[PDB]
């Protein structure tokens, strides 16, 4: 049934830019169970541009190999706006943009074998105290190590503080999903690594991080 793990790893490794501990990936595949596969998408764009194709085909490889792909809509942070200012996304915009993503993605993935989820599902129920707990798990110095934060800080461009909370949101999504693997583009390394780090801090086995080219 489940392919030998050495062969799974050969099909997963092709076309990828980096795998953070293949030693951890091989161990998960040798467990011979459906790994939970997380791929997150911001719902602001009108569609997925054709540069996502490699990424979606890699989710296809995971699903063909028997693992469970979760297609995650990061709607929570996009629907929060300013206190009384340009507005945030309505729910109507999230649901309409996500519908277009799904019709794109399901020309490749099987809908009966893919989970579609919105991270407001757990995050609507989180209190302010929950987010403070989360925020205590990372240092300001590590957040400023992200490339986009490093340039803005040195070019003396303001970084609002909630921008430091968004990667913590993405990392916790991994805990809420019990992700075994999370995929993203070459430039998402920092954010993907956040879930691997937070998971250990919450008592979970960590995820493997896999990057592919997003053209």
Domain residue spans of the chain = 1-215
The CATH code that applies to domain 1-215 is 3.40.50.620
- DSSP structural state of residue 43: T
Q: Are 75 and 119 in contact (CB under 8 A)?
A: yes
Please give the C-alpha separations between residue 211 and each of 146, 154, 181, in angstroms, as whole numbers.
16, 27, 11
Beta bridge partners of 118: 73
Q: Which residues contact 37 (CB under 8 A, 6 or more apart)?
A: 59, 62, 63, 67, 68, 69, 70, 179, 180, 181, 182, 183
Resolution (Å) of this entry: 2.1
Q: Are 93 and 59 in contact (CB under 8 A)?
A: no
How is the beta sheet containing 36-41 ordered, strand by strand?
18-20, 208-212, 181-185, 36-41, 68-73, 114-118
Label the pairing between strands 208-212 and 18-20: antiparallel
Closest CA to 66 of 39, 33, 38: 33
Q: Are 166 and 134 in contact (CB under 8 A)?
A: no
């Amino acid at each position: 049934h489940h392919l030998p793990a050495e062969e799974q790893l050969a099909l997963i490794q092709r076309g990828t830019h980096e795998i953070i501990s293949e030693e951890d990936l091989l161990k998960k595949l040798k467990e011979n169970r459906p790994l939970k596969i997380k791929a997150g998408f911001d719902p602001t764009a009108p569609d997925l541009h054709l540069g996502h194709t490699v990424l979606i085909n890699k989710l296809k490889t995971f699903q063909d190999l028997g693992h469970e792909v979760t297609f995650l809509i990061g709607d929570y942070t996009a629907m929060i706006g300013d206190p009384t200012t340009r507005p945030p996304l309505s729910r109507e915009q999230v649901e309409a943009n996500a519908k277009t993503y799904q019709e794109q993605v399901f020309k490749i993935l099987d809908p009966n074998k893919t989970k579609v989820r919105f991270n407001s599902e757990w995050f609507n129920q989180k209190s302010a105290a929950d987010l403070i707990q989360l925020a205590s798990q990372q240092t300001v110095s590590r957040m400023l190590e992200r490339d986009d934060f490093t340039k803005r800080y040195n070019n003396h461009q303001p970084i609002a503080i909630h921008e430091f909370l968004y990667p913590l949101v993405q990392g916790y999504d991994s805990i809420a999903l019990e992700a075994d693997v999370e995929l993203g583009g070459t430039d998402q390394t920092f954010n993907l690594l956040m879930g691997r780090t937070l998971q250990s801090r919450y008592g979970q086995e960590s995820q493997v991080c896999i990057t592919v080219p997003i053209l």
